[PDB]
Design a protein around this motif. Sequence first.
Motif, PDB file in Angstrom:
ATOM      1  N   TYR A  83      46.981  51.494  41.350  1.00  0.00           N
ATOM      2  CA  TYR A  83      46.681  50.467  40.361  1.00  0.00           C
ATOM      3  C   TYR A  83      45.526  49.583  40.821  1.00  0.00           C
ATOM      4  O   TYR A  83      44.371  49.859  40.467  1.00  0.00           O
ATOM      5  CB  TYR A  83      47.966  49.673  40.059  1.00  0.00           C
ATOM      6  CG  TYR A  83      49.089  50.621  39.646  1.00  0.00           C
ATOM      7  CD1 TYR A  83      49.135  51.158  38.358  1.00  0.00           C
ATOM      8  CD2 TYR A  83      50.047  51.052  40.563  1.00  0.00           C
ATOM      9  CE1 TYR A  83      50.137  52.050  37.979  1.00  0.00           C
ATOM     10  CE2 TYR A  83      51.044  51.955  40.196  1.00  0.00           C
ATOM     11  CZ  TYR A  83      51.084  52.453  38.905  1.00  0.00           C
ATOM     12  OH  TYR A  83      52.070  53.345  38.536  1.00  0.00           O
ATOM     13  N   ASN A  84      45.779  48.676  41.764  1.00  0.00           N
ATOM     14  CA  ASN A  84      44.721  47.901  42.413  1.00  0.00           C
ATOM     15  C   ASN A  84      45.370  47.073  43.516  1.00  0.00           C
ATOM     16  O   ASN A  84      46.597  46.961  43.599  1.00  0.00           O
ATOM     17  CB  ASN A  84      43.924  46.996  41.446  1.00  0.00           C
ATOM     18  CG  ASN A  84      44.806  46.028  40.681  1.00  0.00           C
ATOM     19  OD1 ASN A  84      45.205  46.295  39.541  1.00  0.00           O
ATOM     20  ND2 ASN A  84      45.095  44.885  41.293  1.00  0.00           N
ATOM     21  N   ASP A  85      44.523  46.502  44.368  1.00  0.00           N
ATOM     22  CA  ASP A  85      44.967  45.807  45.566  1.00  0.00           C
ATOM     23  C   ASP A  85      45.777  44.568  45.233  1.00  0.00           C
ATOM     24  O   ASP A  85      45.246  43.583  44.711  1.00  0.00           O
ATOM     25  CB  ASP A  85      43.769  45.417  46.446  1.00  0.00           C
ATOM     26  CG  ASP A  85      43.184  46.615  47.187  1.00  0.00           C
ATOM     27  OD1 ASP A  85      43.869  47.662  47.251  1.00  0.00           O
ATOM     28  OD2 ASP A  85      42.054  46.511  47.707  1.00  0.00           O
ATOM     29  N   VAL A  86      47.080  44.630  45.483  1.00  0.00           N
ATOM     30  CA  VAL A  86      47.921  43.441  45.421  1.00  0.00           C
ATOM     31  C   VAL A  86      48.870  43.319  46.599  1.00  0.00           C
ATOM     32  O   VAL A  86      49.235  42.190  46.966  1.00  0.00           O
ATOM     33  CB  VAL A  86      48.693  43.418  44.073  1.00  0.00           C
ATOM     34  CG1 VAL A  86      49.214  44.728  43.820  1.00  0.00           C
ATOM     35  CG2 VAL A  86      49.894  42.479  44.103  1.00  0.00           C
ATOM     36  N   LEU A  87      49.210  44.404  47.302  1.00  0.00           N
ATOM     37  CA  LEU A  87      50.297  44.391  48.270  1.00  0.00           C
ATOM     38  C   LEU A  87      49.783  44.576  49.698  1.00  0.00           C
ATOM     39  O   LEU A  87      48.817  45.294  49.942  1.00  0.00           O
ATOM     40  CB  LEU A  87      51.322  45.484  47.943  1.00  0.00           C
ATOM     41  CG  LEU A  87      52.109  45.363  46.620  1.00  0.00           C
ATOM     42  CD1 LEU A  87      53.125  46.468  46.539  1.00  0.00           C
ATOM     43  CD2 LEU A  87      52.780  44.007  46.505  1.00  0.00           C
ATOM     44  N   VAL A  88      50.491  43.958  50.640  1.00  0.00           N
ATOM     45  CA  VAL A  88      50.138  43.926  52.058  1.00  0.00           C
ATOM     46  C   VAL A  88      51.100  44.839  52.809  1.00  0.00           C
ATOM     47  O   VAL A  88      52.311  44.833  52.537  1.00  0.00           O
ATOM     48  CB  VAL A  88      50.211  42.472  52.580  1.00  0.00           C
ATOM     49  CG1 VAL A  88      50.442  42.419  54.070  1.00  0.00           C
ATOM     50  CG2 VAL A  88      48.953  41.683  52.213  1.00  0.00           C
ATOM     51  N   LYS A  89      50.557  45.643  53.747  1.00  0.00           N
ATOM     52  CA  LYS A  89      51.362  46.541  54.597  1.00  0.00           C
ATOM     53  C   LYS A  89      51.964  45.765  55.764  1.00  0.00           C
ATOM     54  O   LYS A  89      51.237  45.057  56.471  1.00  0.00           O
ATOM     55  CB  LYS A  89      50.506  47.680  55.152  1.00  0.00           C
ATOM     56  CG  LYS A  89      50.349  48.864  54.229  1.00  0.00           C
ATOM     57  CD  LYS A  89      48.983  49.481  54.326  1.00  0.00           C
ATOM     58  CE  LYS A  89      48.906  50.419  55.481  1.00  0.00           C
ATOM     59  NZ  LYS A  89      47.735  51.320  55.385  1.00  0.00           N
ATOM     60  N   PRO A  90      53.267  45.864  55.997  1.00  0.00           N
ATOM     61  CA  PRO A  90      53.871  45.200  57.151  1.00  0.00           C
ATOM     62  C   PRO A  90      53.864  46.094  58.386  1.00  0.00           C
ATOM     63  O   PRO A  90      53.704  47.317  58.299  1.00  0.00           O
ATOM     64  CB  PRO A  90      55.307  44.959  56.670  1.00  0.00           C
ATOM     65  CG  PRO A  90      55.577  46.219  55.878  1.00  0.00           C
ATOM     66  CD  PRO A  90      54.294  46.428  55.102  1.00  0.00           C
ATOM     67  N   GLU A  91      54.056  45.452  59.545  1.00  0.00           N
ATOM     68  CA  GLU A  91      54.217  46.113  60.836  1.00  0.00           C
ATOM     69  C   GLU A  91      55.589  45.766  61.371  1.00  0.00           C
ATOM     70  O   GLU A  91      56.110  44.688  61.090  1.00  0.00           O
ATOM     71  CB  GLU A  91      53.179  45.643  61.904  1.00  0.00           C
ATOM     72  CG  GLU A  91      51.707  45.884  61.614  1.00  0.00           C
ATOM     73  CD  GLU A  91      51.260  47.321  61.856  1.00  0.00           C
ATOM     74  OE1 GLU A  91      52.025  48.136  62.426  1.00  0.00           O
ATOM     75  OE2 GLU A  91      50.114  47.626  61.478  1.00  0.00           O
ATOM     76  N   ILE A  92      56.150  46.642  62.198  1.00  0.00           N
ATOM     77  CA  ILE A  92      57.379  46.305  62.909  1.00  0.00           C
ATOM     78  C   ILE A  92      56.996  45.493  64.138  1.00  0.00           C
ATOM     79  O   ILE A  92      56.403  46.028  65.076  1.00  0.00           O
ATOM     80  CB  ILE A  92      58.170  47.551  63.308  1.00  0.00           C
ATOM     81  CG1 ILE A  92      58.615  48.321  62.065  1.00  0.00           C
ATOM     82  CG2 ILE A  92      59.395  47.144  64.124  1.00  0.00           C
ATOM     83  CD1 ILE A  92      59.332  49.634  62.379  1.00  0.00           C
ATOM     84  N   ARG A  93      57.361  44.213  64.158  1.00  0.00           N
ATOM     85  CA  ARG A  93      57.097  43.394  65.339  1.00  0.00           C
ATOM     86  C   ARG A  93      58.089  42.248  65.404  1.00  0.00           C
ATOM     87  O   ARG A  93      58.219  41.491  64.446  1.00  0.00           O
ATOM     88  CB  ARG A  93      55.667  42.832  65.346  1.00  0.00           C
ATOM     89  CG  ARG A  93      55.097  42.670  66.754  1.00  0.00           C
ATOM     90  CD  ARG A  93      53.956  41.669  66.817  1.00  0.00           C
ATOM     91  NE  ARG A  93      52.895  41.980  65.870  1.00  0.00           N
ATOM     92  CZ  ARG A  93      52.272  41.059  65.147  1.00  0.00           C
ATOM     93  NH1 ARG A  93      52.564  39.777  65.272  1.00  0.00           N
ATOM     94  NH2 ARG A  93      51.352  41.436  64.263  1.00  0.00           N
ATOM     95  N   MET A  94      58.764  42.120  66.538  1.00  0.00           N
ATOM     96  CA  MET A  94      59.536  40.931  66.835  1.00  0.00           C
ATOM     97  C   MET A  94      58.681  40.060  67.742  1.00  0.00           C
ATOM     98  O   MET A  94      58.293  40.536  68.814  1.00  0.00           O
ATOM     99  CB  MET A  94      60.838  41.302  67.532  1.00  0.00           C
ATOM    100  CG  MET A  94      61.524  40.115  68.133  1.00  0.00           C
ATOM    101  SD  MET A  94      61.992  38.918  66.851  1.00  0.00           S
ATOM    102  CE  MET A  94      63.523  38.279  67.546  1.00  0.00           C
ATOM    103  N   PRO A  95      58.309  38.839  67.363  1.00  0.00           N
ATOM    104  CA  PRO A  95      57.316  38.107  68.185  1.00  0.00           C
ATOM    105  C   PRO A  95      57.774  37.800  69.599  1.00  0.00           C
ATOM    106  O   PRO A  95      56.967  37.887  70.534  1.00  0.00           O
ATOM    107  CB  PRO A  95      57.062  36.831  67.373  1.00  0.00           C
ATOM    108  CG  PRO A  95      57.448  37.207  65.950  1.00  0.00           C
ATOM    109  CD  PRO A  95      58.616  38.137  66.107  1.00  0.00           C
ATOM    110  N   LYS A  96      59.038  37.444  69.804  1.00  0.00           N
ATOM    111  CA  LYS A  96      59.551  37.176  71.150  1.00  0.00           C
ATOM    112  C   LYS A  96      60.864  37.940  71.299  1.00  0.00           C
ATOM    113  O   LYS A  96      61.895  37.504  70.779  1.00  0.00           O
ATOM    114  CB  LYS A  96      59.761  35.678  71.386  1.00  0.00           C
ATOM    115  CG  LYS A  96      58.554  34.782  71.070  1.00  0.00           C
ATOM    116  CD  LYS A  96      58.045  34.062  72.326  1.00  0.00           C
ATOM    117  CE  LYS A  96      56.882  33.110  72.020  1.00  0.00           C
ATOM    118  NZ  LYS A  96      57.168  31.703  72.446  1.00  0.00           N
ATOM    119  N   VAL A  97      60.845  39.073  72.000  1.00  0.00           N
ATOM    120  CA  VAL A  97      62.081  39.827  72.169  1.00  0.00           C
ATOM    121  C   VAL A  97      63.003  39.054  73.102  1.00  0.00           C
ATOM    122  O   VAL A  97      62.572  38.553  74.149  1.00  0.00           O
ATOM    123  CB  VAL A  97      61.796  41.253  72.677  1.00  0.00           C
ATOM    124  CG1 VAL A  97      60.941  42.004  71.665  1.00  0.00           C
ATOM    125  CG2 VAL A  97      61.088  41.243  74.022  1.00  0.00           C
TER     126      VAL A  97
END
Lengths: 321, 321
Positions: free
Chosen positions: B158-172
């Motif tokens: 369709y067109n750019d609206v959505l952002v791809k997430p990453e798996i990340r816990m900032p402080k394990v």
Amino acid sequence: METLFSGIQPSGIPTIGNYIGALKQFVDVQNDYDCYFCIVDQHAITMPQDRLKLRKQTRQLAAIYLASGIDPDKATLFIQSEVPAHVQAGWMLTTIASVGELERMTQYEGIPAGLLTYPPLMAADIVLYNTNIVPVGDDQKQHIELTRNLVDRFNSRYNDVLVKPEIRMPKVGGRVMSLQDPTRKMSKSDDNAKNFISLLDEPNVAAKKIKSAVTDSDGIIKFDRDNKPGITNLISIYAGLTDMPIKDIEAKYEGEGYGKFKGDLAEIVKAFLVEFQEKYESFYNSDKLDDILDQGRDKAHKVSFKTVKKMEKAMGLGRKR
Amino acid sequence: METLFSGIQPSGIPTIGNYIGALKQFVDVQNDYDCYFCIVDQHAITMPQDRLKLRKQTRQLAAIYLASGIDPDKATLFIQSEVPAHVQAGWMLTTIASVGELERMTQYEGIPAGLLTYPPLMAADIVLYNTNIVPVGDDQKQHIELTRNLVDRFNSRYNDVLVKPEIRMPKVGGRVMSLQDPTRKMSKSDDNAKNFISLLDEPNVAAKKIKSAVTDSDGIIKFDRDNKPGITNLISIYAGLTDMPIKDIEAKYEGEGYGKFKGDLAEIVKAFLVEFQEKYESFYNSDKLDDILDQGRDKAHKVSFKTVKKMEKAMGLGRKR
Ligand SMILES: O=C(O)[C@H]1Cc2c[nH]c3cccc(c23)S1
Ligand SMILES: O=C(O)[C@H]1Cc2c[nH]c3cccc(c23)S1
């Protein structure tokens, strides 16, 4: 008073067969039944859709229903995606459906998942409004059967909140057949455009289609489906548009041939579409169309919100506030 | 600032392992990241649920997160079903997923359909908030892979609206293992209740579980996972609850045996839960809990509404108003 719910695909213009079979009857039964006319844009995107084609089609269907006489105060005319309860309840019913059940519906890049998961959303469309009757055809029998089964499952497992619908059209209109294939029903998606008369066909083009309908060269104006399906289909269209009884049409054309009858009918079809399309353009090009669709959305939201909240309490979603 | 999104199952009380691994870290990273903590009651009903068990569990998780220090002004703490965008966007992404794709997720009366169709709702949960990071484990890698693929498909088609997430816990946080099976992670659903310490365990009961942890009869207080996983796990719990560095713990107990260390740790665990459960009861039994959950719902609705509207315009749902 019974509640009726009809889902409207924004995927094509209704023909004069759809007008005679259904739309004209809705204009009358909206006085005696609590009618919901829902443009199901969320069902439409289960199929591949062009996104400007879709938004335009939605407005077009709204305008066609209003031009037909569907009255936004008597009936509730709204767009499905504008009422969140539909996907809220659709998800709740999905969780109680079985994959096997959904797969058997699909029978009666890859395969888009909406084509498998839409039936519980159809069930939600209906049961949100406590619908008693749905005016659909034989092709939708499995969907209503699933709807009824989901209602039973929901009430059995949690508690009584949902009403089972029946398939019933309160006043069946005439069956209108393809103009150049009189044994098949008229269809907006025919590859032979002479087969159907679109409600948005140019009125001169429609009159030509009445003239190109496949019939004997000449004959009497008598209703006879099995032997003269061609002229009989035209008599049905004539009866559907004028409300003249069929026996009255036969008596009016006693001693007349096809050319006089088809001439009068072509002029009737042309006059009907001239009047229809003037109302259609005025709705389609007016600012009040958004006002009307807002009002319908608010009416539907008020009713479906209570149903959704009862469902949420029954399943334990959300909070007790 | 990056956006973090974490989905919270209302299906069980977190343990002190979940507290040390995740919750305590969230209390710190909510200052440096825009955090969404979403109690996913609509995912919970894909499984068989008792409806009063479910509504109570939802409030309990909310209270546990607040008792942990999750701050409703710094972070957004809300209930999934109270924000319609989740099922709105979930349905939109369902239509672009493939049945094959969903079926392969299920691998990595009949089978309830929610168990097949929930992944696009998970994707919607995340991408509605323009999430950059999701703090999940190896068991959710396929779900984020599908999320990223759905985002790519949506933007491509369709067109750019959505952002791809990453798996990340900032402080394990530290890994906390089962108290009587030190090679397995601690789990709230263990059939051996001595294996886990619930955040809602009676504080005296928790202290007994520290004492019944499976270790050598005696030894030095030294961190050694491969040879002494029992005492090492306890050192990890001690470090997780006091923030004392592990080398500092070893130096503090130089010349001490297990009984003195386990005695001090049992008292630490008991004091922690006494303080934790007082905050928990005050949130759980207060009228402000509904005020807090309302505020979180409104914050999430404001952000996810804009995303939903961008999605609707991209697919051609609804109207241009
Ligand atoms: O394609 C069609 O005709 C069906 C589309 C649809 C979606 N939701 C409902 C509810 C009642 C009736 C119908 C529908 S008819
Ligand atoms: O069961 C679990 O842990 C997952 C539940 C869930 C639903 N929606 C999201 C979004 C992000 C992360 C998670 C979830 S984690």
